[PDB]
Amino acid sequence: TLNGGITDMLTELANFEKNVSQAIHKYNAYRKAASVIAKYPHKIKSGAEAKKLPGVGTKIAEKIDEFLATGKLRKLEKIRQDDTSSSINFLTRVSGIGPSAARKFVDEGIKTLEDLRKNEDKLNHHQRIGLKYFGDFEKRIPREEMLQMQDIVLNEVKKVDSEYIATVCGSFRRGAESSGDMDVLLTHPSFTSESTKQPKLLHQVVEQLQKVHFITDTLSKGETKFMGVCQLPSKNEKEYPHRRIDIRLIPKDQYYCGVLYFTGSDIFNKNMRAHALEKGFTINEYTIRPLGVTGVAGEPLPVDSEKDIFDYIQWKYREPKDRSE
DNA sequence: CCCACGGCCCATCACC
DNA sequence: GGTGATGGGC
DNA sequence: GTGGG
Numbered sequence: 254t255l256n257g258g259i260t261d262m263l264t265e266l267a268n269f270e271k272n273v274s275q276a277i278h279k280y281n282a283y284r285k286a287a288s289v290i291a292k293y294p295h296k297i298k299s300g301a302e303a304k305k306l307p308g309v310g311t312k313i314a315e316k317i318d319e320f321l322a323t324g325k326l327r328k329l330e331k332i333r334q335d336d337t338s339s340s341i342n343f344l345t346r347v348s349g350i351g352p353s354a355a356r357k358f359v360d361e362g363i364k365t366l367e368d369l370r371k372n373e374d375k376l377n378h379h380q381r382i383g384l385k386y387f388g389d390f391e392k393r394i395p396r397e398e399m400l401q402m403q404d405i406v407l408n409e410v411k412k413v414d415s416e417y418i419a420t421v422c423g424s425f426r427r428g429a430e431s432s433g434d435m436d437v438l439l440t441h442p443s444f445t446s447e448s449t450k451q452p453k454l455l456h457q458v459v460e461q462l463q464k465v466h467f468i469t470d471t472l473s474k475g476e477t478k479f480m481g482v483c484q485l486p487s488k489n490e491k492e493y494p495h496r497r498i499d500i501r502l503i504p505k506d507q508y509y510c511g512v513l514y515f516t517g518s519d520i521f522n523k524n525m526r527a528h529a530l531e532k533g534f535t536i537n538e539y540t541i542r543p544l545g546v547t548g549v550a551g552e553p554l555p556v557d558s559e560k561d562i563f564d565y566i567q568w569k570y571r572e573p574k575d576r577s578e
Numbered sequence: 579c580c581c582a583c584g585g586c587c588c589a590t591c592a593c594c
Numbered sequence: 595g596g597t598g599a600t601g602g603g604c
Numbered sequence: 605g606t607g608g609g
């Protein structure tokens with residue numbers, strides 16, 4: 254909340270570049286600037302002060318100057334008033350509609366929730382589910398409900414096979430009081446980086462959760478990755494909101510790089526890979542690998558904790574609750 | 579000045 | 595029909 | 605939009 258007025262401006266500018274301009278690198282630029290400003294311990298009094306930070310350059314500093322002088326930014330006013338940009342920005346709030354589809358709809362004169370209902374025939378399955386649960390999907394999930402969800406997922410997973418390990422990651426694991434969705438990491442001793450020892454590994458768990466009517470809809474489903482919709486049961490009382498759930502099956506011998514990754518935050522992961530590279534390592538969601546002189550990655554290093562990955566790249570260990578960058 | 583900007587799974591659509 | 599191309603998501 | 609090169 255120290256520099257919240259600035260980070261809101263930068264976030265809104267970022268979304269505009271992603272959704273409307275389709276400039277993904279500008280989007281990331283703004284997001285980067287917002288994050289670096291966000292973990293800055295003094296409250297910014299001028300743009301030149303902010304320009305000291307990496308990620309904040311000339312253009313953003315100007316915008317910070319204009320904002321601190323007037324409490325708003327003209328560029329954002331023009332954007333909000335512009336009706337095509339407005340329409341396109343809104344449609345992307347529907348799951349399954351990205352910058353491309355949103356722009357295509359608006360060009361056809363389709364630019365509201367009602368217009369989407371009226372033209373439902375033009376939506377794919379994903380976009381239809383997103384439209385259906387539009388309100389629910391923009392609701393935060395209180396941590397109290399996450400724990401109820403966690404209990405159910407962990408248990409039904411046990412009911413299929415007790416050797417399964419299901420770990421809730423994401424913002425939940427970072428100890429957030431509310432989450433946008435539920436992220437589940439799944440492993441089994443059969444599945445390592447050396448085979449396909451079980452087929453239907455992810456299917457069994459998905460199917461079991463559908464059977465107890467916890468999972469209600471499927472957005473996508475393959476052999477290692479499920480993207481879908483879930484809902485808590487009601488005791489008798491108003492229904493719980495339908496929630497987004499992601500399930501990711503990962504080789505058991507790569508569990509810790511997996512849980513590090515799926516815990517996030519997404520920007521923290523960009524920071525960690527960025528530092529890891531300066532220290533002669535390449536990290537992804539699966540492994541950490543050393544680099545030779547030529548910039549050629551060796552074979553995966555041994556990992557048996559999250560702290561192990563931190564030690565290689567010589568970072569002091571940070572609790573998941575301190576990765577919300 | 580100029581360019582690189584963590585990446586891969588899954589669904590669908592254009593094209594043959 | 596099978597594909598390669600692309601979008602959307604994490 | 606930014607910073608390293």
Ligand SMILES: Nc1ccn([C@H]2C[C@H](O)[C@@H](COP(=O)(O)NP(=O)(O)OP(=O)(O)O)O2)c(=O)n1
Binds near residue numbers: 424434516519604
């Ligand atoms: N581009 C991306 C997208 C996601 N991720 C990782 C880090 C995230 O913590 C994890 C899950 O993403 P997520 O569910 O969209 N957001 P996250 O759980 O961190 O916070 P919420 O908005 O869900 O409450 O995937 C990433 O590293 N790079």
Ligand SMILES: [Mn+2]
Binds near residue numbers: 432436
């Ligand atoms: Mn999440």
Ligand SMILES: [Mn+2]
Binds near residue numbers: 435498499604
């Ligand atoms: Mn998620």
Ligand code: NA
Binds near residue numbers: 304305307308309310
């Ligand atoms: Na700077």
Ligand code: NA
Binds near residue numbers: 344346348351
């Ligand atoms: Na969307």
